[PDB]
């Protein structure tokens, strides 16, 4: 069996110039509430502050590409729309390889507004990080960006920019198999 997707949120990335493409996300709207609505509201830009012109700071090779911290690019901030933090709901799903998004926390019930992404099947991160999505198209874009040259701080030398981050509506919840991407 497989979980159901409700909405699609599409990012349009660019490496300084000559944009790479568009990365679609399908968000599990019925499995995990209180984390999908936060993400869509942050993306579409309805509360003023949003994801537009973010920066993927940690681009660790074949581990993750974090990001989403819109306040400052240091990588230890970010405020949601549910106050500042909010708690974890339920880890009904686990990390099944490349393409399975999550939420990045600094402890217990310390969810903010920062991404996760996987590139290899991680098993020691199941039961700590809530999962709320799974990439659908454009995984080649992720594979391309994860190869950029970084210093010994994982921050890429060439800045990556989310030029657009909108919201795409789906008229029917369709399930997706849980293999990879």
């Amino acid at each position: 069996k497989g979980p159901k997707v409700t909405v699609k949120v599409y990012f349009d990335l660019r490496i300084g110039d000559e944009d790479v493409g568009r990365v679609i996300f399908g968000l599990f709207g019925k499995t995990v509430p209180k984390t999908v609505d936060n993400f869509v509201a942050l993306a579409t830009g309805e509360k003023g502050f949003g994801y537009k012109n973010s920066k993927f700071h940690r681009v660790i090779k074949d581990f993750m590409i974090q990001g989403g911290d819109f306040t400052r690019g240091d990588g230890t901030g970010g405020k949601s729309i549910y106050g500042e933090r909010f708690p974890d709901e339920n880890f009904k799903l686990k990390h099944y390889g490349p393409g399975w998004v999550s939420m990045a926390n600094a402890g217990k019930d310390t969810n903010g507004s920062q991404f996760f992404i996987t590139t290899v099947k991680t098993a020691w991160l199941d039961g700590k990080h809530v999962v709320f999505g799974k990439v659908l198209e454009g995984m080649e874009v992720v594979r391309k960006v994860e190869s950029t040259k970084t210093d010994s701080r994982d921050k890429p030398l060439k800045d990556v920019i989310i030029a657009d981050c909108g919201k795409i509506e789906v008229e029917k919840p369709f399930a997706i198999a849980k293999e990879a991407a």
Partner: protein, 399 residues
């Protein structure tokens, strides 16, 4: 009943930090309505579900003297069928589960009455002085160590149009406001007007106890990241969760007796009500009520010499037959019995499984405590007094 309160409070803060006073006042009002709507919904749903599919116990069922294999299975199936009926009803009529949970810091900001701060500032700006003094006085009652609020109240009172009748609280439960008002009216020798407030205090106390018994059937709490290796069985998880729920229900008798203006919870809450009632009815002239209330006090503490003397005086002046025919209150009897049974069960669980528990009352007899943990309790009291003395000595050394 509405969108989550935390989102509304965050929107109100963001709007207030840029000077949009109508927006902040509207958002704060909406949040303060939503929280109460949510709590009322939970209370009503839980009470209705508990009362619509009751626990149909079957003491008439003697399972089997001869057979022993299937009878336990039949009993388990019937009990869990009743449980499944209750759970289905609850899940259907509670509604969405997202709105019913919120962060702990949000509860902290909703117990310090911060929205009342934002509302008083914005309502002073809007020139709505009545709804400004209301919010300012409510916040000041909420935190009595803010003399800035005191000078703000002085600045508001200097302006004309302020009414004394508008000094309302709008936040504290009635069973505490009525009690404090009754004791204040009594302290100055006004027994005639003292009784109604205390009687309402008992009525509202029993209603509030019934309302607060059905509000810690909440999620189980874990020792941080200890739920990754939680490996307990079915009849162990059931008993663990029920023990914690009973701990909630027995520790919700020290929360009904705490006012933020007082740094410590009241000592002997409810027997004190009865003591004041008997004294008031003594002073008035109604003496059957005085003897009834004295007796209903003695039932809680049967080793009080002074109140025994008072009861002897009341009986001596009155008729012996009337005093003998009059007995304790009924609701006090039921409250005492149910609390005693819960304490007995919790103490047995403490003795066997090893789950801590601190008695929230003083009327508890000695027969319910096992003769194994009293040693530990006085040991911990010794450590507490030693730590207090050592902190005092450190303070003396610092000087």
């Amino acid at each position: 009943g509405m969108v989550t309160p935390d989102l509304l409070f965050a929107e109100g803060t963001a709007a207030y930090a840029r000077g949009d006073w109508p927006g902040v006042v509207l958002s704060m009002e909406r949040a303060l309505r939503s929280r109460a709507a949510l709590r009322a919904l939970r209370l009503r749903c839980r009470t209705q579900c508990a009362a619509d599919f009751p626990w149909e116990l079957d003491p008439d069922w003697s399972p089997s003297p001869a057979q022993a294999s299937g009878a336990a299975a039949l009993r388990d199936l019937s009990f869990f069928g009743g449980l499944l009926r209750r759970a289905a009803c609850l899940r259907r009529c509670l509604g969405p589960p997202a709105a019913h949970s919120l962060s702990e810091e949000m509860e902290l900001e909703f117990r310090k009455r911060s929205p009342y701060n934002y509302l008083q500032v914005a309502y002073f700006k809007i020139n709505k002085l009545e709804k400004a003094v209301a919010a300012a006085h409510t916040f000041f009652v909420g935190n009595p160590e803010h003399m800035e609020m005191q000078q703000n109240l002085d600045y508001y009172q200097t302006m004309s149009g302020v009414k004394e009748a508008d000094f309302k609280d709008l936040e504290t439960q009635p069973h505490m406001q009525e009690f404090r008002l009754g004791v204040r009216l009594y302290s100055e020798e006004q027994p005639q007007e003292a009784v109604p407030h205390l009687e309402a205090a008992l009525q509202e106390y029993f209603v509030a106890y019934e309302e607060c018994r059905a509000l810690c059937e909440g999620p189980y709490d874990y020792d941080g990241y200890n739920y990754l290796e939680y490996n307990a069985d079915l009849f162990q998880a059931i008993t663990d969760h029920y023990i914690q729920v009973l701990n909630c229900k027995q520790n919700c008798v020290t929360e009904l007796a705490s006012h933020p203006s007082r740094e410590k919870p009241f000592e002997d809450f409810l027997p004190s009500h009865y003591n004041y009632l008997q004294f008031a009815y003594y002073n008035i002239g109604n003496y059957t009520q005085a003897v009834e209330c004295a007796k209903t006090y003695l039932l809680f503490f049967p080793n009080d010499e002074v109140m025994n003397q008072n009861l002897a005086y009341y009986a001596a002046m009155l008729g012996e037959e009337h005093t003998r025919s009059i007995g304790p209150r009924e609701s006090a009897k039921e409250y005492r019995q149910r609390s005693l049974l819960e304490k007995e069960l919790l103490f047995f669980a403490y003795d066997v499984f090893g789950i801590p528990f601190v008695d929230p009352d003083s009327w508890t007899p000695e027969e319910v405590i096992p003769k194994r943990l009293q040693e530990k309790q006085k040991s911990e009291r010794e450590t507490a007094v030693r730590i207090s003395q050592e902190i005092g000595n450190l303070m003396k050394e610092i000087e």
